[PDB]
Amino acid sequence: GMTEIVKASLENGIQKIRIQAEKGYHPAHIQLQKGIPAEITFHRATPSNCYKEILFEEEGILEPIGVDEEKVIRFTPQELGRHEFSCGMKMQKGSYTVVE
Ligand SMILES: [Cl-]
Numbered sequence: 001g002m003t004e005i006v007k008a009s010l011e012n013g014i015q016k017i018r019i020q021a022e023k024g025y026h027p028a029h030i031q032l033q034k035g036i037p038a039e040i041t042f043h044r045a046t047p048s049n050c051y052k053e054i055l056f057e058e059e060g061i062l063e064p065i066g067v068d069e070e071k072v073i074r075f076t077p078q079e080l081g082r083h084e085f086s087c088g089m090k091m092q093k094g095s096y097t098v099v100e
């Protein structure tokens, strides 16, 4: 250890954070506050189709993302703890930890 966790920035009652998709997700591990609307912006910086989709299974989210495009994943985290996000193939993984 330790594992690097990046906290989402709180402003205007929204928590925002940007994630780059290229040779994995960066940051791969983030922290979110429970009950605050979250906007997680993914940028696909690779032409590999391994990254053509963004999956947040526990939120029922599955979103396509094109080469060099940015997609905002929006939800309000309600369940505490560590949750997984990944590409649509579940080959490249990350996590979001929801704290009180
Ligand atoms: Cl692949």
Ligand SMILES: [Cu+]
Residues within 6 Å of the ligand: 049, 050, 051, 087, 088, 089, 090, 091, 092
């Ligand atoms: Cu993938």
Ligand SMILES: [Cu+]
Residues within 6 Å of the ligand: 049, 050, 051, 089, 091, 092
């Ligand atoms: Cu893949």
